[PDB]
Design a protein around this motif. Sequence first.
Motif, mmCIF file in Angstrom:
data_model
loop_
_atom_site.group_PDB
_atom_site.id
_atom_site.type_symbol
_atom_site.label_atom_id
_atom_site.label_comp_id
_atom_site.label_asym_id
_atom_site.label_seq_id
_atom_site.Cartn_x
_atom_site.Cartn_y
_atom_site.Cartn_z
ATOM 1 N N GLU A 116 64.074 6.200 1.043
ATOM 2 C CA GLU A 116 62.955 7.111 0.847
ATOM 3 C C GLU A 116 62.932 8.251 1.857
ATOM 4 O O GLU A 116 62.009 9.071 1.822
ATOM 5 C CB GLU A 116 61.632 6.340 0.912
ATOM 6 C CG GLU A 116 61.143 5.828 -0.434
ATOM 7 C CD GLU A 116 61.945 4.642 -0.934
ATOM 8 O OE1 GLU A 116 62.910 4.245 -0.249
ATOM 9 O OE2 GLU A 116 61.610 4.108 -2.012
ATOM 10 N N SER A 117 63.920 8.324 2.752
ATOM 11 C CA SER A 117 63.950 9.409 3.727
ATOM 12 C C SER A 117 64.030 10.763 3.034
ATOM 13 O O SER A 117 63.368 11.722 3.448
ATOM 14 C CB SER A 117 65.130 9.224 4.681
ATOM 15 O OG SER A 117 66.352 9.134 3.969
ATOM 16 N N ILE A 118 64.835 10.860 1.975
ATOM 17 C CA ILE A 118 64.927 12.110 1.226
ATOM 18 C C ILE A 118 63.579 12.456 0.609
ATOM 19 O O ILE A 118 63.147 13.615 0.630
ATOM 20 C CB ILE A 118 66.030 12.012 0.156
ATOM 21 C CG1 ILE A 118 67.408 11.902 0.814
ATOM 22 C CG2 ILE A 118 65.986 13.220 -0.768
ATOM 23 C CD1 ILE A 118 68.452 11.245 -0.067
ATOM 24 N N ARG A 119 62.895 11.458 0.046
ATOM 25 C CA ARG A 119 61.605 11.709 -0.591
ATOM 26 C C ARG A 119 60.587 12.237 0.412
ATOM 27 O O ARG A 119 59.836 13.173 0.110
ATOM 28 C CB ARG A 119 61.094 10.426 -1.251
ATOM 29 C CG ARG A 119 59.678 10.512 -1.812
ATOM 30 C CD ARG A 119 59.586 11.498 -2.967
ATOM 31 N NE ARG A 119 60.371 11.066 -4.120
ATOM 32 C CZ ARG A 119 60.040 10.053 -4.917
ATOM 33 N NH1 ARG A 119 58.931 9.358 -4.694
ATOM 34 N NH2 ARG A 119 60.818 9.734 -5.942
ATOM 35 N N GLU A 120 60.538 11.645 1.606
ATOM 36 C CA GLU A 120 59.561 12.071 2.603
ATOM 37 C C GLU A 120 59.807 13.512 3.031
ATOM 38 O O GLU A 120 58.871 14.316 3.120
ATOM 39 C CB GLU A 120 59.608 11.135 3.811
ATOM 40 C CG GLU A 120 58.993 9.770 3.555
ATOM 41 C CD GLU A 120 58.964 8.905 4.797
ATOM 42 O OE1 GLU A 120 58.660 9.438 5.885
ATOM 43 O OE2 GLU A 120 59.244 7.692 4.688
ATOM 44 N N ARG A 121 61.067 13.858 3.304
ATOM 45 C CA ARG A 121 61.382 15.225 3.707
ATOM 46 C C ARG A 121 61.109 16.208 2.578
ATOM 47 O O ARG A 121 60.628 17.320 2.820
ATOM 48 C CB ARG A 121 62.838 15.317 4.162
ATOM 49 C CG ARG A 121 63.066 14.887 5.607
ATOM 50 C CD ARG A 121 62.384 15.826 6.591
ATOM 51 N NE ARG A 121 61.108 15.293 7.063
ATOM 52 C CZ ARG A 121 60.174 16.012 7.679
ATOM 53 N NH1 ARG A 121 60.364 17.306 7.906
ATOM 54 N NH2 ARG A 121 59.045 15.437 8.070
#
Lengths: 411, 192, 184, 101
Positions: free
Chosen positions: D79-84
């Motif tokens: 989910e790192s991509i989603r948060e950024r």
Amino acid sequence: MRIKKKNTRGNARNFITRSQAVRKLQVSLADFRRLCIFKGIYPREPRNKKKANKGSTAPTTFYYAKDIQYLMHEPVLAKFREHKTFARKLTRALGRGEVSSAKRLEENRDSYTLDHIIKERYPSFPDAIRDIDDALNMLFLFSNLPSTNQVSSKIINDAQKICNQWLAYVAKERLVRKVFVSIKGVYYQANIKGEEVRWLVPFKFPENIPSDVDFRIMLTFLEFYSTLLHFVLYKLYTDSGLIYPPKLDLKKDKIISGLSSYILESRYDSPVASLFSAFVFYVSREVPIDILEFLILSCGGNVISEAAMDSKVTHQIVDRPVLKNKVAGRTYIQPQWIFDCINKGELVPANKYLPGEALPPHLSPWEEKKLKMIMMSNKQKKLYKKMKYSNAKKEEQAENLKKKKKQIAKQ
Amino acid sequence: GLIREKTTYDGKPALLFIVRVRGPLAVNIPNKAFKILSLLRLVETNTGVFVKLTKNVYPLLKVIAPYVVIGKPSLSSIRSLIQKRGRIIYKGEPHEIVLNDNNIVEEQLGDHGIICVEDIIHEIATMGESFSVCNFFLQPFKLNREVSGFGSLNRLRKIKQREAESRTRQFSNAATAPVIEVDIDSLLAKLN
Amino acid sequence: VKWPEYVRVQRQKKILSIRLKVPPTIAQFQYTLDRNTAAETFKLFNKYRPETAAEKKERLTKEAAAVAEGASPKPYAVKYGLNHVVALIENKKAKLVLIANDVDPIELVVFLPALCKKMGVPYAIVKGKARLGTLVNQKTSAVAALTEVRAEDEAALAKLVSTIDANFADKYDEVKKHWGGGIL
Amino acid sequence: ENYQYDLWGDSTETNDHVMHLRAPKLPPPTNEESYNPPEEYLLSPEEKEAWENTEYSERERNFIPQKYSALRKVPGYGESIRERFERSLDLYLAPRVRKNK
RNA sequence: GAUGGGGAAGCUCCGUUUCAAAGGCCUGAUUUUAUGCAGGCCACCAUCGAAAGGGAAUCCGGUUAAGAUUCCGGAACCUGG
């Protein structure tokens, strides 16, 4: 003067609708939003919605007229038209069949530069550091992502190079103050001239690329952040008297391909920057040497990587289920010791992080009123009720934590 | 801008990486190649897999020379490929979940001594005992292909990339045709 | 309902040409080289694209640079100029002639196939003047012709000429009859 | 030497001269979401389902904290991509309103 | 009465919607072989023409060598933000 129409002055003309702004700019929404992101423009909400939106109650988005007007004079707008014309003429050549003409045209094109955007967006150097948090986060996220049809390999390579240069500069100057590890990834809070800049660093594991997200906006953000970080790093190197760009040793790049690869040369002021002074730490295969090595290098002495050509050390970092040999000449410490040492800043005792020993929890470094309320007004009564509810909800943070601690204490 | 040198093939088990070339254009995969690449699970374009340079595989590599290219990647490239791309085809049933969980390595192998991705990287780089087991567990990495675009600039870039194949990739078709060895590090830096 | 005046005018022109009887001298086109042989001709002609301005300029600069420090035969190329094409025709020097079927002034090209057949020079009608233009570094030429060719492509040129004679010249010699534009 | 020049130099200009130039609004610091946090912070099995049933933008805690016994056991984050991506969208699309807390 | 047109060698006459590509509103995460724009709705179309036509709003008192719903004092009402 004659009668003045209501929707012709004040908020009516102070803010321009997004649809009207696009029409006025005569620029596609993609290019318009690219320019907005480059200039760091954002929508604004007036105190009255209908007044600004020509007296019409709609979910319209409002933008400042002055900012949009200033945007129209940016050379980037002309550069976009030049790029569009070049693309059209190159498609013409490709359809015609004269590939050589397309190559000649490509050899002549030059890409625009956001240098003048950075100057006005960040009038002073400290401003760039004060907001480089998002740029660092995006660059660190992209550097670990795999190349796909959307993002080119060169872009990811450049982002990784920028991240490596930033890490090398941080390690050389030992500006790390606080670190943290979370599910989202490891966090680093350096101190660049006192800005206490924080930047997330995700784990070096594969990441799934769902189709839901749109990298087109992310591509533009990374493009801007690339120039931003390049200029910031150049300024920092010039201030520190270090050569720029810093060359990298290909021999190290083949072996480790990371922090130690970049050999930065010219041409200590805080306890955090003195931990593990003159010490050498061994790192096992299980631990993330990429994260651990940077922390130790910034804090104290060098590190011996588990990698080899495929001792005078004092401590060894290992996270194996069972210790292998535990040579008397190497102290065995869990990776949690480094994080706790950095957080405390006073070399927390090593006798609490021996291999196999339970690790301690990790903590982030960051009566008459009932009647008297009758005389309160409606608005004051509502405000007091909201304040009481906010106090009650905050009390739950402690109540449910103490209850769960009591439940856990049973065993 | 290119150099060549004839070197005698040894018998030591050197580490090699195989990348699918998807060609020649008009050649239909013959039964021999159909079976050879099927056993190496290189049945898709851009597929990558690690193998052992044993003398029993040299004839097969020579035969499939037109269909693939080979080289000797460095430790850094292998580590980057493993930690950035991976596949786990097991119960999760055909789920392609990737190496985001080191505990899965413990669960599947357990006794082999491979408990993390770095252990697999070291075993591959040093011809470890678990090379056969881990490699099968390490289903081939679906490397991203070339530009992969059809457009104004993309077609021009593809033309330039293709023109370099004649200057870099060639085959004599003779039994004595030496196996072409190229620096896989540069290819990975281009593909990845 | 209303559309742009020029669009309506051109649509009316199309539906009139489709319905207006024309003399055999007109409608000699619309019986053209098939897609297969047309593609083969394009492939053969694609190897003889005339040197563009950039190519000639770079070659001349390179030659001058070598000369400043201190033999080859005539480069074979396609001939496309209408005045030059009509001059190679009537002189027997032309071997293959391509005629565009979509020339705006029809009178400029009506007599070309007739003259080519009278002189006994192979000729072929190919759809699209732009296609001729795309292979000549010009927008359009309405005509294309071939001259002395490399020995390697001599056999290909002879085979293409034989195919054209078998397919278009002999088959469509009946075009003299059947006044075009007779569709109901 | 492209981009290798100091465009700032000795300067003291302030971008906030115009009040409309609001602050970047840096994200708040993380709080007790460590990879090895106190086990009391762990969400109960029914509370996990209740939180999962919640819609988006009402997900202050975007994950369930877990007591990972070892660093090696720490898995990756997808989910790192989603948060950024969400942060980037909010930066240039979320209406900025000046207010006093 | 231009506007788009037609007649007239021409100074010019016809024609006011005349078979003109005659403008004015909104939405989207940035539009998927990868950052060159997509979609939703209406079809009229300048201007001049009235100090007796409709109209947004000031009443009183006093004052001058000539001016008062205007100049001074008091108190009023309309439009926009």
